[PDB]
Write an enzyme that holds these catalytic residues in place. Structure first.
Site, PDB file in Angstrom:
ATOM      1  N   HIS B  41       0.812  -1.211   0.000  1.00 41.09           N
ATOM      2  CA  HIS B  41       0.000   0.000   0.000  1.00 41.09           C
ATOM      3  C   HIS B  41       0.855   1.275   0.000  1.00 41.09           C
ATOM      4  CE1 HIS B  41      -0.430  -0.223   4.585  1.00 41.09           C
ATOM      5  NE2 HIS B  41       0.307   0.859   4.353  1.00 41.09           N
ATOM      6  N   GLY B 143       1.999   6.084   9.689  1.00 40.85           N
ATOM      7  CA  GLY B 143       3.429   6.074   9.393  1.00 40.85           C
ATOM      8  C   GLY B 143       4.137   4.850   9.962  1.00 40.85           C
ATOM      9  N   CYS B 145       3.374   1.745   9.404  1.00 42.70           N
ATOM     10  CA  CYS B 145       3.318   0.629   8.473  1.00 42.70           C
ATOM     11  C   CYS B 145       4.689   0.201   8.001  1.00 42.70           C
ATOM     12  CB  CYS B 145       2.375   0.948   7.323  1.00 42.70           C
ATOM     13  SG  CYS B 145       0.701   1.348   7.876  1.00 42.70           S
TER      14      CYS B 145
HETATM   15  C1  LIG Z   1      -2.072   6.396   2.293  1.00 46.61           C
HETATM   16  N1  LIG Z   1      -1.977   4.972   2.582  1.00 46.61           N
HETATM   17  C2  LIG Z   1      -0.728   4.390   2.127  1.00 46.61           C
HETATM   18  C3  LIG Z   1      -2.647   4.424   3.650  1.00 46.61           C
HETATM   19  C4  LIG Z   1      -3.867   4.951   4.084  1.00 46.61           C
HETATM   20  C5  LIG Z   1      -4.563   4.359   5.123  1.00 46.61           C
HETATM   21  C6  LIG Z   1      -4.004   3.308   5.840  1.00 46.61           C
HETATM   22  N2  LIG Z   1      -4.730   2.667   6.887  1.00 46.61           N
HETATM   23  C7  LIG Z   1      -6.188   2.686   6.831  1.00 46.61           C
HETATM   24  C8  LIG Z   1      -6.755   1.405   6.273  1.00 46.61           C
HETATM   25  C9  LIG Z   1      -7.733   0.574   6.894  1.00 46.61           C
HETATM   26  C10 LIG Z   1      -8.003  -0.570   6.174  1.00 46.61           C
HETATM   27  S1  LIG Z   1      -7.065  -0.618   4.735  1.00 46.61           S
HETATM   28  C11 LIG Z   1      -6.316   0.873   5.096  1.00 46.61           C
HETATM   29  C12 LIG Z   1      -4.161   2.166   8.024  1.00 46.61           C
HETATM   30  O1  LIG Z   1      -4.798   1.518   8.840  1.00 46.61           O
HETATM   31  C13 LIG Z   1      -2.699   2.528   8.300  1.00 46.61           C
HETATM   32  N3  LIG Z   1      -2.414   2.522   9.720  1.00 46.61           N
HETATM   33  N4  LIG Z   1      -1.788   1.460  10.288  1.00 46.61           N
HETATM   34  N5  LIG Z   1      -1.732   1.642  11.575  1.00 46.61           N
HETATM   35  C14 LIG Z   1      -2.322   2.850  11.864  1.00 46.61           C
HETATM   36  C15 LIG Z   1      -2.531   3.506  13.073  1.00 46.61           C
HETATM   37  C16 LIG Z   1      -3.166   4.741  13.053  1.00 46.61           C
HETATM   38  C17 LIG Z   1      -3.593   5.309  11.855  1.00 46.61           C
HETATM   39  C18 LIG Z   1      -3.401   4.656  10.646  1.00 46.61           C
HETATM   40  C19 LIG Z   1      -2.759   3.427  10.677  1.00 46.61           C
HETATM   41  C20 LIG Z   1      -2.835   2.728   5.367  1.00 46.61           C
HETATM   42  C21 LIG Z   1      -2.145   3.297   4.312  1.00 46.61           C
END
Ligand SMILES: CN(C)c1ccc(N(Cc2ccsc2)C(=O)Cn2nnc3ccccc32)cc1
Ligand SMILES: CN(C)c1ccc(N(Cc2ccsc2)C(=O)Cn2nnc3ccccc32)cc1
Lengths: 304, 304
Positions: B41, B143, B145
């Site tokens: 992603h 961030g 990830c």
């Molecule tokens: C812009 N992109 C690359 C992106 C945008 C969103 C995310 N998502 C949302 C999501 C939910 C189901 S699929 C994607 C994450 O959960 C990421 N994430 N990981 N742990 C976190 C702790 C707090 C907030 C965010 C968090 C990842 C990547």
């Protein structure tokens, strides 16, 4: 989101751990620059520990009696001195992995990470706090002596603790890196009982703010209190008195959540008086006191 | 003595953390040999995440679009491929800090350490477990990830987890280092609800053995039970069924304490039925399930 008892990354400290052997005693040392710091009880036998005269015991030791091993290579000891309850072994090689460092003496309520070691090798890392009775509730086995407590600010490691002993009650005692014990403990196998282990009130409030930031809000009530009223309840429950300094330190968490410090104190007051009722806060069934307000801010903002 | 939620020393993994940027998305990568592993992603925008077609999105990306930075130095990307939900970025330099490593897919109930990172920099280390519903209860912010879960056996790091997402319920989902998600989660911002978060029974029993080894014995009772009887109670309390394999794995802890596994099951049964009554076990007011029998043995024996 999510809130964990997080330790600092230990790599910078792992590169400083060495094995120190004197006679039949082997423990851990901390190698910074050309000095290896270790508990002075390395010169003792288990029998000596009953009533040791460290100055007299040290007279019978020379540089060559201190065996310092870093990985699988031997370090040459060219000097040795006793500073309070630690020995400083001057070696002929500066540790090439020496990070930027400071030696700090922490206050009770302050948290740090411990890198538990055996034979100069790291076995694990965990987060703990200096208790108000100057003990730490760690995880140490025989041979863990010389393991250190530290904090990290970006690239500078602040060493605050060196492990020396376990009291008969399973709690731990040690020194700062100048060799001074925290609390009234002495490196002698004698009757040493710890004082009251009170709860670090400012830390509990910080952790309640972390819970609100992470979604756990059930304990938020419709009340407020005063510092004096809150402190009457805190005394009754063996909680440390909350001061205006503590309120001030909680200001950024109060600002972030929009919950005034005294309102959170009233929430804590009801939790103390009524209990959790089989409920949990951040996956815990008791009030956590080993996260400072700085730790809560750091974890909730991701300081690296 | 003392029992702590201990993480492995993270130094070996810290030397593998890098920053990967693709477009306006920056996350963490794991650099092992001449390959940087990261969540696929990284090629997405926040809008793309609603319904991403990773194969189509990847067609618009070339080697030069993946910015890999290790410390303050840029790594040259000479190849890129998608393996399940991870990208493998082939770089022209092998990581000189690459430890001995394996990629393992763990089972639910198994524990590991997480080195939380932001912009390729480690912020903290904590211990967690793969839940029976294939989520982890971590501490991750935007961030984080690409942060990884791992175990260490002396000098070999076994990577088991890579962080990908946070579900709407505050729990976390990720993949093994082959890019396969644990559980039924997909890297899409869609309705994904976790299943029942049951308690890891064998881990609770291991932690009860750790409590006996460390002096907490109040919960030991005069009863015994059978696997079938214990399991009727375990089902009622959303505890995982205890199998003969689990009993066998607890054998060394049973031998060390002299408390038969089924007697400890009867102790656990009474704790489930009657509660703690305001009492604690190893400083916890709930039954801890994030220590495996191997972790209890390791911590109580000091494996480095
Ligand atoms: C812009 N992109 C690359 C992106 C945008 C969103 C995310 N998502 C949302 C999501 C939910 C189901 S699929 C994607 C994450 O959960 C990421 N994430 N990981 N742990 C976190 C702790 C707090 C907030 C965010 C968090 C990842 C990547
Ligand atoms: C032989 N020498 C050098 C030696 C002998 C005994 C010890 N003592 C006992 C003691 C009590 C008051 S003064 C000394 C420790 O507590 C050491 N210690 N530290 N943490 C431990 C976890 C478990 C068991 C042992 C532990 C230290 C050194």
């Amino acid at each position: 989101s999510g809130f964990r008892k997080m330790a600092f990354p230990s790599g910078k400290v792992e590169g400083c751990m060495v094995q120190v052997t004197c006679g039949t005693t082997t423990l851990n040392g901390l190698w910074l620059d050309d000095v290896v710091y270790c508990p002075r009880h390395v010169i003792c036998t288990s029998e000596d520990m009953l009533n040791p005269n460290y100055e007299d015991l040290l007279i019978r030791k020379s540089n060559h009696n201190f065996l310092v091993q870093a990985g699988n290579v031997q370090l040459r000891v060219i000097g040795h001195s006793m500073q309070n309850c630690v020995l400083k072994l001057k070696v002929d090689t500066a540790n090439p992995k020496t990070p930027k460092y400071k030696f700090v003496r922490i206050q009770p309520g302050q948290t740090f990470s411990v890198l538990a070691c055996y034979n100069g090798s790291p076995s694990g890392v965990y987060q703990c706090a200096m208790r108000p009775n100057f003990t730490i509730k760690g995880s140490f086995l025989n041979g863990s002596c010389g393991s250190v407590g530290f904090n990290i600010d970006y690239d500078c490691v602040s060493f605050c603790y060196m492990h020396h002993m376990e009291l008969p009650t399973g709690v731990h005692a040690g020194t700062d890196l100048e060799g001074n014990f925290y609390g009234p403990f002495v490196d002698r196998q004698t009757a040493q009982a710890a004082g009251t282990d009170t709860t670090i009130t400012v830390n509990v409030l910080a952790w309640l703010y972390a819970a609100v930031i992470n979604g756990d809000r059930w304990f938020l009530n419709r009340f407020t209190t005063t510092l004096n009223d809150f402190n009457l309840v805190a005394m009754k429950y063996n909680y440390e008195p909350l001061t205006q300094d503590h309120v001030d330190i909680l200001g950024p968490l109060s600002a972030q959540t929009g919950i005034a410090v005294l309102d959170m104190c009233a929430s804590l007051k009801e939790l103390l008086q009524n209990g959790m009722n089989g409920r949990t806060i951040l996956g815990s069934a008791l009030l956590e006191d080993e996260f400072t307000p700085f730790d809560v801010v750091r974890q909730c903002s991701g300081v690296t």
